[PDB]
Paper text:
SPH1118 has been identified as a pectin-binding protein involved in both pectin chemotaxis and assimilation. SPH1118 shows high homology with the solute-binding protein (SBP) associated with the bacterial ABC transporter. SPH1118 consisted of two domains with a large cleft between the domains and substrates bound to positively charged and aromatic residues in the cleft through hydrogen bond and stacking interactions. Here we show tertiary structures of SPH1118 with six different conformations as determined by X-ray crystallography.
Interestingly, SPH1118 showed three conformations [SPH1118 (open form), SPH1118 (full open form), and SPH1118 (closed form)] even in the substrate-free state. These conformations were probably present in equilibrium in solution. The crystallization conditions of SPH1118 (open form), SPH1118 (full open form), and SPH1118 (closed form) contained the substrates (ΔtriGalUA or sodium PG). However, no substrates were bound to SPH1118 in these structures. The crystal structures of SPH1118 (full open form) and SPH1118 (closed form) were obtained only under crystallization conditions in the presence of sodium PG. Compared to the C terminal domain of SPH1118 (full open form), those of SPH1118 (open form) and SPH1118 (closed form) were closed by 18.9° and 34.2°, respectively, suggesting that the domain of SPH1118 was flexibly opened and closed even in the substrate-free state. SPH1118 (full open form) opened the domains more than SPH1118 (open form), thereby increasing the surface area exposed to the solvent and possibly accommodating the polysaccharide more efficiently.
Numbering used by the authors: 1 to 610
Amino acid sequence: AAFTQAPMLEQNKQLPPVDQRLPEKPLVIKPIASNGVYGGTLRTVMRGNADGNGILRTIGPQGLTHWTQDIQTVEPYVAESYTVSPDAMEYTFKLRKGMKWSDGTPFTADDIVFAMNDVVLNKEMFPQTPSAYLVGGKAPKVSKVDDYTVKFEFPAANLSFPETLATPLGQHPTLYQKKYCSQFHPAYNKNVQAEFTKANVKDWPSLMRAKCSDIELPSRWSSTERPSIDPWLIKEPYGGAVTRVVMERNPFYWQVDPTGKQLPYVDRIQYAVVSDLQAIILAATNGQYDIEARLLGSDVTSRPLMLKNQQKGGYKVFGQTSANANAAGLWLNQTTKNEKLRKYMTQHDFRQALSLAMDRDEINKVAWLGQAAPWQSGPFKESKWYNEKLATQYLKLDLAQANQILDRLGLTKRDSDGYRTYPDGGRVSLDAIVMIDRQAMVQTLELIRRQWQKAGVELVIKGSERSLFYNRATANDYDISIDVFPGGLDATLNPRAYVAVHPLESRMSLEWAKWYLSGGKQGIEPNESMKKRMALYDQFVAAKTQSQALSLFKQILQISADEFEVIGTVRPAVISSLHSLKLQNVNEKMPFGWPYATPSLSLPQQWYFS
């Protein structure tokens, strides 16, 4: 009885009063910076007519949980609260009594149970269940406990599930209104076949996708009648050839600010549909967008143009933090077929010397324009996974120490070109594979080649397109592979740099990874420290409590630090973004990435115009 609404809703005479449209207890959103005011149209942009995730990452997945701003944990979001059983298998969600869909009808456990059992877990709909809802490849039992309580029962520990529910790919539970969607489902509509010709499809899964959609389908944004719990609703749909998309506030949105205003603050979102980046950067520098945090930061050429024109365009450039720990890390192949090299590749002090012979300040200045600070492979300080050794050991150039180590390891005989040689002959030479489309990585290797020559080590660059790059890796035909190190902020989601579990990307040895993934039937058996990390990883995946998962995974990171298997160059540059100076409550320190649906991580329903 203390809630208010956007003035524009006063004119809609088929709406109940705002306190009746809200849940009994709406979710209260604390603003990023200040309490807001109603009004305005958020101007943003999509590139082409297959950029529908741009809508999703603008308005935000409305999942059962939501990431915190530092993406260190999640909180109840659509769910009022939830419990986790001691064995980490059972997840029980309480829902917000009185919450309604965009069409004013009830949002209840019926919708979640329909979404899971009749859509997600239906083998005609999804012959392969989306991995978001699996553990060890197995699905949960999903049950209605009462109108506002739903239970997920997995057959194995699954502590990641609340985090999964905060990602775009884990939002199916709240995406399907049973009332609307059941019309297109044969378990509920005996005459669903009559719907096929209407929708212009030939089977009921295609019909469901057409009318009710999926996370990333164009049909999610192509109709006005598909109910949702989104902060804004499609009004001018994202059509195959439309030039703009318009969305308008959901009168039944289920959140208020601390003063009782039903969110969102902003009345409408208008998406310009634009043909290419050249046109998008121009409009952005002209100040035609109130927010752009998806497309411009992918193109390293955009930042100078954006900064130059801030005052002209009335906008502020800000920098988001990529999840990757390293922009261009050296993956050293412990199972290189070069037998003479392998006897050195497997020695910690050899890898240490190579890191000490690198000048990361030069790499940063020359190949990354000074925007990418030296770093190894470890999580960042703002991550709960931070390990100082894993992040910072062996970062500083010490050519004398590198040469002293290499002398000590017996690589003292120089050939006629000045390079070190193995004790029984042969130049100390490492083949590094690189994708030429990663131009900054190629230049980084060129700088490393010049630096390592000062330590008597030859780096031979082998640039190719993607397919040959991956062919060589999977064939175990490389000494070094250069590519990102994940783990700056997403170490458990993407642990490939710390334990050899990714079949294509854990390039300290994909033969080790093949062994792990095949249960020892294929590949090459890893060394003891890696087998131990693999055992710790399996235990971490099966952990029953947060504190147990934390201690197990920290052990993996410590062993990875002690081994020093992969050599980082520089952490990624910030991702350049902009918001108009009038747009308030944008979290300018938020990370970047698809699992967090950025920029919607920042809660666009509490952005507002001053």
